[model samples]
Target chain A: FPTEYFLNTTVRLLEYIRYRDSNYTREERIENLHYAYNKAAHHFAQPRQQQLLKVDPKRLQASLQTIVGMVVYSWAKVSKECMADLSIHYTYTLVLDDSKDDPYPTMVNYFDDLQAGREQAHPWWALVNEHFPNVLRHFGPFCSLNLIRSTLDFFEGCWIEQYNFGGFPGSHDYPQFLRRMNGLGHCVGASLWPKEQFNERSLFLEITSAIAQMENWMVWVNDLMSFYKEFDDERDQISLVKNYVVSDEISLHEALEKLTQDTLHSSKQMVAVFSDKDPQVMDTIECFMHGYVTWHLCDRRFRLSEIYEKVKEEKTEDAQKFCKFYEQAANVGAVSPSEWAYPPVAQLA
Target chain B: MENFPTEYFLNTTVRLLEYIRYRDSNYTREERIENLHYAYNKAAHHFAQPRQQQLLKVDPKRLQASLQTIVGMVVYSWAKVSKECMADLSIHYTYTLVLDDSKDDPYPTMVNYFDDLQAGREQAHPWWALVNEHFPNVLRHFGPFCSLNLIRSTLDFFEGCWIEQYNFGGFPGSHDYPQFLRRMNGLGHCVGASLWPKEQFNERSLFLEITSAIAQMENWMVWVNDLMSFYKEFDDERDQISLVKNYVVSDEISLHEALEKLTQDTLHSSKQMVAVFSDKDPQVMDTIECFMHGYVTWHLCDRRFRLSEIYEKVKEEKTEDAQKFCKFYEQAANVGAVSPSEWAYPPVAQLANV
Candidate 1:
């Protein structure tokens, strides 16, 4: 079903698709954005008496350190409301994904109450609800029903589909599994593309197979590369790598090998799917894969995966000059991992 | 299949043959055990030195993880596998021990190993020889091609755990962690399932379900590992991670609160798996009991863990009590419902006396 929809999304011309580049330079803006995030992000959580995380300045600083908000928005080149739109979602994802026993659950109840048309906005639910209007104000102009549907689907997939468990999927159910499992994965990239591109033919070409292949690669590579460093230390969660090998496909080598092959095939087919379109645009589309992979490889966040090999093949690449996990602290970016744009101060508001 | 001669092995059968007799209908004790030993020696040979070299600096502290190895032994003894199988099972456990301490050599974190896998070189792994050895026995014992699935599952368990901490700082709640733990923890069960005598494997599909049942047990054991290793993992001296700390870190909650919930979650999860999977095969049920019972005894008696002063002294009598089955041993979820009432728990107590 996820594939069927994605496959039907016909690839279009960049200009026709409104593929406009952002107005700001990546570096100077990201620097300022990081400054703004540090100052402002904590304020959102400050109003509540039972703070979500104790609001310890040091801890708050540590958490906000993931300037992924800056990185992702910049990566998408959505310099428009980069802070107001995507940054908020990035924060929302970080907090909820990390939320455990009561805080997030409490907020969810408040959200449900609002959704059922029972309450105005409970202060408890204010933060979660705040995103709705903010998103509408920012991207509502661009909203296709599918885009809005994707937004709703992300929550439904994680919050509801997750809570109600058949737990992990068994073998032969991989397609359904990916559909439900990926909300943020689908939403983030779809948020980058134009509304017309959200259709079935486009989705399948870009998402179902091509971007889906990239997404799958990103996820598995992440899990495999990071599992060693994470499982013993962080016990983060069951990653796609863990789930696939344990149940479906059954072999790590075969599964990963399959992913690698699929990625190559998917990339080629994506261009072929758009054989009717601009070659330059199609080539840029392919950069999504390269930029993402290079980002993964160069990002200091994944330094641990590469650290063991440092003694031998340590290549001093250009990105190495600025490679530190803590600085900029944000995660998303285009090639070279430079921020997507320094959203104008006008947009940061 | 010549070594798997079904009829000629009548004289070679041991006293447990009749106890095992009421089980699977396919192969004799000799053939089944031959499958096991072939698995053991091959594995032991593969990792003995290479694994040692890999984790030479951080060899897992003894008794912390290697518990799975002994659990396999208890399982083999109960299922009535040949002594050779026990030896092979022990080898399997040794690599696992290396797995804990030498996190460097084998996977996930290790650079060279990761490169090889990504580059499509399973042969690059020193353990592949052992994997090859263990695989044939699994196929021979489990069925045919699905044995391929079973081997893949075990290897999957190996890779599944390789997924390091993607959640980074996020503390996973109860709804999710069990599935991951089950995959990493169930190799013994999968390996144990393969040793689940052919006679009782009447349903090929059901065999997979049996793998799942043991999966539940495996999750419980892993949590117990977390619980037992808590002291070592959290001690400023060790630099290791524990589930307790992980949950605490994620929620910013206190460690004590997380441990309380972890223990309850593990206990409940174990029962849930058994409630669903531990019927029909009497020994499977007994194996579940033995595994839990053996875990308790092992955790109590193993001094390497610094678990309790209670475990400080060798509680030989209690240990032996659990180990002596009076005797027997234990898999997935699907084909049919197995009734527990047909079972008389612990083959040793029944057959040891017989």
Candidate 2:
């Protein structure tokens, strides 16, 4: 029920798939597309029916497809223009798995743990490969740029899927892992990166950058969708995990300061590697920023279930603390005017 | 639950009896009277315990005694005044039982045909024998001159009992017979000869004079009580016999008109007899008339049940009818007021709180 917007967007993507491949006469492509669309719609629509009514499956599917199409079309244009900023760069690298010890070995084993986790958690990722085998068919033969674009496209799907599922610690744990990774990057300065390179704004860069921006959109949407559930779980008497931890005596201003700081820190880190001259990269960064920031404010205003629970339990004392965080987060970048061109990244050329 | 007020009053009477008889042992006559007063106070306190508590042996015994004493006093006074009125040649023999074969014989036969029917039917007539047996005691206590006054005083208590029981007809045949009896009386006068010749008034003459009046009072009281229960019964839909039959067309004004007619007729008949009577005869009749008129009006106006039901169900159609009757009854003689002189009839002089 809560993830209706994301599910709807996903359904629109499936419709786009159908529309895009309509010219292709291959029965396998049509069948695979239909199966994927039905599977995704079933998962989303089933929960919604349980919450609302079970009548009219076809109507629900069509409605979801329409909304998803609208959302994707709008965000795709915004994401494309935003990714044109040369300051925005798509970064992918291997991080050594130090959690597992190889004391006698000269070199430690490395794996793309994030990709492994995503592939393992979601059935749709495997389904995507099965349906669009050509996308991954050139992975071994083509240059690494193709690999990056393919990976970005794959992750973009995973991002949308995870956004639909809930959020990080879910189908795509990458955004939250990236937040932690960015924190470590601030101190270590790319110590985890085995090899990194920057390329000019080409098709590879355009799609990879678009996918990165799309990933941010997914994170923002995921947070928006999970706002209430996360709040509920965080303050649940039995639950140990917390979405945002603040002091019992934290004032409304102080709590909000913490939330905005966290949100800006997360958004900035998400676009940390971008360059200034890549067309509308700043626009993409702003779109991502707007979504993330707006989501935080919306959640603070309307979806503070944890705060509500705390207020119910402790009355004014804990309520004041929750209010501080909520109000501060709500006030951050309160006026989100539409931008015609990308905002420049200061350090990039 | 059906007749909660009457049951509560009955229970109160029982408690008073207990206090008068057993609880005041340590006091002198005057002190015992004080103790009796306090003991009587406890009755109101415990009055609301369910009917099961009220029907306990001790409670019932005290209740029966209290009812008998009060009703006996009224009957004795009624008998004495009728005797006096006969001696004075002011009234006539009015106590003869005019057996309506159509209604009476069938009921008795029905009771006989079904073994359990008679006993079951008689169960609702709680005050019949109790009042009958207590009449002489009232005469002894209040004297022959005050006999009619006692009857007037006790009449309401029995009226309340009869009406309450009648309202329970929805449950079974138990209360139905009495209700049918009252309805039969309403249709026509049911007169019977006096058991004894009046000392001053001629038996037949006085009986005819008062038959309409007596039946009117009895019928009025019965309807008033019925309406009270009907209000309660309809409001409590969960009740077993929750039939909505209080009025002809589910209209409050119609119901009010029906009750007002009964009251007016009762007051009119009693007032007519009282106005023509000799001085001694006038007092008993006056008391009875005054009491009935006031009691009926008071019940109509102040009783919460009547007000609530009337407000809830009185619509334009029935309201117009009620207004017409109310306007007509307001101007009628002897139907609106009560006098103290004819307080001898049990129906006219009973205290509401008691």
Candidate 3:
């Protein structure tokens, strides 16, 4: 039940830290991040009358100071200031969830405005003008431009998933959304490559659309375990699993089982995608995959929540299947196929 | 050429607003395209940061009519109303309505209202040239004492855009709804507050609480509108863009039950907010009472609104929320449409007398 999270985080982050460009120091990563955080703290919960979101910090260090933004930056072993700047955008997810994950209705008021925009009368357009520039300035018209385009693609995908409940992932549609969400983690990771690099956007979806089932399965396992209070609250239901329940995706226990199984299959595919590459390249990719699981499993932010619950069907047969699904996810590289396997595109078309 | 009359801009706006004619083709009957149907139509077509459940493209016409309608009602409450004053105020209200009705905040989140607005966001906005050509032609000719709040509030309206934000199709819930409404609806009053001169509204300035209370009244009036509008809104394509639609879909409640719920939400809110300034802001309440009464009276009687032929079926029910208030309030003293000599809380008290 208890894992040494901080210990594992340090180990994973240090291994990647070795890959940092020569001009950047590991000590500077810690110092630059911590120093900038306090300087930009007020941004996390924007003040009233300010009428804007916190976007452009004077320094990329300040932007990276946010909780998850900093973690993504370090974990990605990103470009000096610019890559951190790229990851800072991901903090939006953190900002949105921090407010939403709460059981209390009011905690989410400010971010709701962020989502509502003009029809709902939230001040937002100017924020884009002021801060969207930082990306172009740092990432540049060519390389950084790709970063924004990719991140925008990632953002709208998440937006579509969040707002368009009608547009959820079926088994067929699963890999697209999974790649859209998880691949963003990859996209942020890929921001570290030289300017011309991107879209590296992927053939995974085109190939094994079902590979999405695997990514989704793993994500839901995290979702199901991490946010218990949301689904638990009869007085104030807040979790997305409830959305799944409402949508008739599966009964609560069925999803838990389905997800873990999907994780094992896709986790195996995750290995196949990287197979013909160099060992160094292979290790980096594996490390990223492993780092992703480790981050979620161990992060206190996920574990310590007002939203705490064990699955109601934990003792059922389906629950056992789900456990096996998770158990095999981390070991996919062990028995992974020699090459990628996929569903026929002709079947979907 | 240098001598276009100073009265020129006033005549120009009147001509411009005359251009907006409502057409109803079967294809145009589609909610997104309907001329007056708000949401994503030719008028007010700004939708960003969303999903269907997250953000239903709601019509801002109720809110605009709320603004323009409030202006008419506001003129009735004012301490002064000369012909020149009426023209100046009308010019201002027309500008806000026309500018708002057609243009939208293309970027609907934070910072854009102020920061991007400063960097030519407004001028660079999608509908800029539309609002641009009209305003300069008039306010430019009008010389000094231009009621620029109409221009400035477009910028200012979005500044408080955060107040009205309920994202990605989520509800701000019943509790937070009133404050959001007040702030969103407050854009009208903020501009209206400028219609009268400072020295004239000296009483309003002195009673900052009354100024704040008037804002609450504007929102309550809109809620009173939402309560009354439920049937008309549902009858039209607006059913999907409603508390009724969302509640009906979200809770699977009976249409009647959902209707009752929205009505109750508004009523409960009205009671709560009216009570905040109740037995207080007396003249202001008198004005709010008239505006509410005036609005309901007109809404019920008009062909486009009230239970006229428009909502053929809903009109059959003749069930009422605003009428409920009329029964409750009319029985009380000095509430509905009582005019004042003090112009003490005039919202067109001058216009009414004149």
Candidate 4:
């Protein structure tokens, strides 16, 4: 029911925003916002609506604003992270460095021989080398970075009424996040790389605009999916005294714990299928795993905080021990695995 | 050199009159006389230039009347003779028939069968039932006979001129009688019942025309070649008449002979190639051969005789005998076991050699 309602409302809001603005952001932009908002607001919103509908209004606005701020900040960070990953992946994958995890060793060797003047290279390399330098030149350091930034802004404005009226952790945020991430990944990979390679100045600008649209949609979807559970729960628990949704009052510890469990469970099935020599696919799987692990590390820390809070309420001596264990575990798991980093080989390949 | 002019001349009026009145009485009609006079005067005026510097005349009225009478007498008879020859040849060559000389036993068939009906018939026996089906109705009877008679008349007219100049043979009146009788026999045999079957009308016409043309041309060439040789010999013997250069006369014969020999030899080689290879490439080669043959024959025979001379000549014995011999020889040579005459498979399968 949560997934269904979240999808419906997110789609409707996206349609409305697109209609109003005369242009809609792309899926990746929307999803970036979704991830950021969901990560921040997951703690404040209640998992179920029955208890959330009786909460106060000022707390809800504060939580929603926090989610929006986290999204805007995290969007910039993710864009940089992804761009760095993409550059590394392209260089390693195409040039065929033995140090890098490339499945197509023959293709790598072929390029290597070509570059070293041992054997003739494929025409495609000459084509790529000829064109890609120009893309790098115009886009500068990170290609389409400005588009990604604009995308974050577009999604920040989307679902304003829902964030204001209903709650922070609404039904329209988390699923919308997944959808946006998928869309942004696709657009960034397809449009940006080709525009840069072809040295099509006009097309590059057009692609940038398209990327911005996709980035916006990504942010909006992410925001909607992130707040989806809390908002829907709050909507269901409306009472006589407190007429509006109060789902944003939920503690971060509890929300994190739930999200961690959900991610861990989902990731088991989400691991990529592997064959004899498929480094790109493997890298893509690793990226998903890294994101999952990161989420779990954050969730575990939040859970530990919740446990410490419970101990404090009872005035227990074990709170200190719990804090120590949480810190150590967070340090080990908080960062993504190297394989599961921001830019998967599959993203560029 | 002083007595004879360097340029040779022809008396067109005399030649025309001689040809027309060769076997008939002269004309007396005023209108005919006027037309003859006009034609004769024009020809005479043209020829009597300083370049020609010689004059000769035969009565034009007589020539016109003679031409009319000859055509009226011999047109149908000549056509009948041609039809008869064609029919004789077709039957002798195409179908397996038992003549007195040959048996009723199966003669090996010449025709081939093919997937295409018309092609099959043509391949199997080229002289098939289609011959009668395709010929023009008028030619179905005597076209070949007329053609042969005309050729003989032309030769006789030229021969008369030669005899008068050389005194080498009997006078025209006496010699013409025997030639006429011989031609009559030739015509009889050519159109004889044993030779010319009734049903093969188309085949009859085709053979008649072909044989007539061939005989006509051959006759003309023989006369021309003889005249050339005689003139050269005369020039050599007398040395008194040095008006016409020997090289000029020899060059004319040489040019003609070269052309005729080249065409004939090429045709012979093509036919041989067809035989050795087989009918696949017969169409183009055969067409070339047929065309060359037709051209050679037409050039020799058709231009000389008036219609009246031909008609009278066809009724004679010597002309008839000549026609009969020509028809028989042509048929035998064409349809017989002669290597050049026999049709063979074409060379289509040899295309891949390239």
User: Candidate 2 on A277-297: residue-level lDDT in tens?
Assistant: 354544433433333333343
TM-scores of the first chain across all predictions? Answer: 0.59, 0.31, 0.49, 0.27
Model 4 Cα lDDT, one tens digit per residue, B267-333: 3333332232233234322322332232222222222222122223343445434344334323322
* B165-193: candidate 2 lDDT, tens digit per residue: 23332212111122322432331111111
Report the CA-based lDDT of candidate 3 relative to the real structure.
0.35
TM-score of chain A of 2: 0.31
| lDDT by residue (tens digit), candidate 1, B1-354 | 012111211111112122222232233334433543444434434334444334333332242234334533443333444444445445555544444433332322232332233233444444443444344333443343223334434554554333322222222222223333333334544444444545445434354344444344445556656655554454454342445555665445666677666656554554454455445467666655544544433443344554343222322325432222211221100111122122212221222233
Off by over 4 Å in 4: A1-269, A272-277, A299-304, A307-328, A333-349, B1-354
Cα lDDT tens digits, model 4, A1-349, are: 2433322342333222221111113334344434443432332233432132222334343334332322222223234333333332232112221122212222333322432334223332333333333223324322333323222212221211112222222212222222332233322322233232333332332232223233333323333344523343454422111111222244434443344333332222222112221343333233332322223224322222333344333332343433343344344333322212222222222
Per-model TM-score, in order, reads 0.37, 0.22, 0.36, 0.18
Cα lDDT for residue A22, candidate 4: 10
Better of 2 and 3 by lDDT: 3
Output DockQ, candidate 1. Answer: 0.02
Give the Cα error of residue B73 in candidate 2, in Å: 14
What are the per-residue Cα lDDT tens digits for candidate 3 across B16-128?
11221111112111221111122112111111122211232224344334333433333433323333343344433443444434334343232233333334344334333
Better of 1 and 3 by lDDT: 1
User: Per model, how many backbone clashes are there?
Assistant: 52, 74, 36, 88
Which of the CAPRI classes, incorrect, acceptable, medium or high, describes model 2?
Answer: incorrect
Classified by CAPRI criteria, candidate 4 counts as incorrect
